[PDB]
Design an enzyme around this catalytic site. Structure first.
Site, PDB file in Angstrom:
ATOM      1  N   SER A  61      35.266  44.158  41.208  1.00 53.01           N
ATOM      2  CA  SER A  61      34.005  44.381  40.549  1.00 53.01           C
ATOM      3  C   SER A  61      32.975  43.253  40.685  1.00 53.01           C
ATOM      4  CB  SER A  61      34.223  44.696  39.090  1.00 53.01           C
ATOM      5  OG  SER A  61      34.910  45.923  39.035  1.00 53.01           O
ATOM      6  N   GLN A 117      36.182  55.322  35.968  1.00 54.58           N
ATOM      7  CA  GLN A 117      36.613  55.654  37.300  1.00 54.58           C
ATOM      8  C   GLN A 117      36.055  56.994  37.758  1.00 54.58           C
ATOM      9  OE1 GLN A 117      39.776  55.347  34.888  1.00 54.58           O
ATOM     10  NE2 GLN A 117      41.011  53.815  35.983  1.00 54.58           N
ATOM     11  N   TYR A 147      31.252  50.213  30.373  1.00 55.48           N
ATOM     12  CA  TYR A 147      31.396  49.694  31.726  1.00 55.48           C
ATOM     13  C   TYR A 147      31.983  50.794  32.635  1.00 55.48           C
ATOM     14  CZ  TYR A 147      32.807  46.451  35.434  1.00 55.48           C
ATOM     15  OH  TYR A 147      33.019  45.774  36.611  1.00 55.48           O
ATOM     16  N   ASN A 149      32.424  52.240  36.895  1.00 49.98           N
ATOM     17  CA  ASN A 149      32.214  52.317  38.309  1.00 49.98           C
ATOM     18  C   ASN A 149      31.393  53.534  38.696  1.00 49.98           C
ATOM     19  OD1 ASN A 149      33.832  50.084  38.740  1.00 49.98           O
ATOM     20  ND2 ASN A 149      35.677  51.294  39.088  1.00 49.98           N
ATOM     21  N   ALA A 315      38.337  42.735  39.688  1.00 50.27           N
ATOM     22  CA  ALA A 315      39.705  42.934  40.105  1.00 50.27           C
ATOM     23  C   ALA A 315      39.856  44.135  40.969  1.00 50.27           C
ATOM     24  CB  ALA A 315      40.626  43.088  38.911  1.00 50.27           C
ATOM     25  N   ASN A 340      45.944  40.077  40.297  1.00 51.79           N
ATOM     26  CA  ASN A 340      45.091  40.471  39.175  1.00 51.79           C
ATOM     27  C   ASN A 340      45.667  39.943  37.857  1.00 51.79           C
ATOM     28  OD1 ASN A 340      43.404  41.716  37.339  1.00 51.79           O
ATOM     29  ND2 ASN A 340      44.073  43.805  37.827  1.00 51.79           N
TER      30      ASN A 340
END
Ligand SMILES: CC(=O)Nc1sccc1C(=O)O
Ligand SMILES: CC(=O)Nc1sccc1C(=O)O
Length: 358
Positions: A61, A117, A147, A149, A315, A340
């Protein structure tokens, strides 16, 4: 390096590697604007390949910082505006829930609950359309941050549509090349595979798998040298010769939303400096699978504040990265690892190093 830098870096990072069982790590410190590099351990355990200043790590990220700046550059070019409706750039997005969702909202995770996701089952582009058309926001736009993606990922995809370039081509030509990031990649070329570290998860060597909007949300790979240059560029943007890129960097570090002590930029996140280390160490989260937070709009946004702790964690399954910098102090750090390991350990180490040098 100067002995002070050597000693604070080594005394912090050696124990971190031991405690977290990190196979390989690279660190850059930017001090009074100049970079100092450190490496430890293995890029590839089986092949006994060391981490070097040329080793490529998956940024995860931290890629979002590149996406935010590329979007900032498109704004500066007059190609897009953050106040534009999403549907201006994806007219097939006709579902009514999209009324009122702007590029700002996508870029800053404030669209109303887009998920972390994109589902694995989303392969094709028609699957992507269907995904977004069918998504139902839990919240009105511009009210809560989650948050995601799927949020900034779609921002990146749309931001480059006016250019007519693919996201990768736009990133290459408009960000990587001007900044001389010549070993930074969305897709690692065969020429550079020898330098591509393996990530380690549960002891297994792994690389990030393909996914929808991967390039835009989590897909950059880079070296510790290029990442140091990235930090230098972000520390002193008004020294960049390319006018739209300079402006894009400043736009990405501007403060659009506030939640607690943190401000949301385009990719970057910021706190006022001096920061309370508990406010960033513990705040670096993520261990929390989903944290929905009410946001306060900053109306209008606050242009990039020099007196900031500007940072991003990242990560993938096999890698953990962290970047932080303080423009006021011409100080920064990059930490790249092929495991990670917990975010709070990253932030704690970064804080200890920068606090000692400040
Ligand atoms: C500090 C902080 O989070 N303030 C917030 S979050 C949502 C609204 C507000 C406010 O100050 O109105
Ligand atoms: C982007 C991505 O794949 N992130 C992953 S896979 C497994 C863990 C994580 C993380 O960000 O913690």
């Amino acid at each position: 390096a100067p002995q002070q830098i050597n000693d604070i870096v080594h005394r912090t990072i050696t124990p971190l590697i031991e405690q977290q069982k990190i196979p390989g790590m690279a660190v850059a410190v930017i001090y009074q604007g100049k970079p100092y590099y450190f490496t430890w351990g293995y890029a590839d355990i089986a092949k006994k390949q060391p981490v070097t200043q040329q080793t490529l790590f998956e940024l995860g990220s931290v890629s979002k910082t590149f996406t935010g700046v590329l979007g900032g550059d498109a704004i500066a070019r007059g190609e897009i505006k953050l106040s534009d409706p999403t549907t201006k750039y994806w007219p097939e997005l006709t579902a009514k829930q999209w009324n009122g969702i702007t590029l700002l909202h996508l870029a800053t995770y404030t669209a109303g609950g887009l998920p972390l996701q994109v589902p694995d089952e989303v392969k094709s582009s028609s699957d992507l359309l269907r995904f977004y058309q069918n998504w139902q926001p839990a919240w009105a736009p511009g009210t809560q941050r989650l948050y995601a993606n799927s949020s900034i990922g779609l921002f990146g995809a749309l931001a480059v549509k006016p250019s007519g370039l693919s996201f990768e081509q736009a990133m290459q030509t408009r960000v990587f090349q001007p900044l001389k990031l010549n070993h930074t990649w969305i897709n690692v070329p065969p020429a550079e595979e020898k330098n591509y570290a393996w990530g380690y998860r549960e002891g297994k060597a792994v690389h990030v798998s393909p996914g929808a909007l991967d390039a835009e949300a989590y897909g950059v790979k880079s070296t510790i040298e290029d990442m140091a240059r990235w930090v230098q560029s972000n520390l002193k943007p008004l020294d960049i010769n390319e006018k739209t890129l300079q402006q894009g960097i400043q736009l990405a570090q501007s403060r659009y939303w506030q939640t607690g002590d943190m401000y949301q930029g385009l990719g970057w996140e910021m706190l006022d400096w001096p920061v309370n280390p508990d406010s960033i160490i513990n705040g670096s989260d993520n261990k929390i699978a989903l944290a929905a937070r009410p946001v306060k709009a900053i109306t209008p946004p606050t242009p990039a504040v020099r007196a900031s702790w500007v940072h991003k964690t990242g990560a993938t399954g096999g890698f953990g990265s962290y970047v932080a910098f303080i423009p006021e102090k011409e100080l920064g750090i990059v930490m790249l690892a092929n495991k990670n390991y917990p975010n709070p350990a990253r932030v704690d180490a970064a804080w200890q190093i920068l606090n000692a040098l400040q």
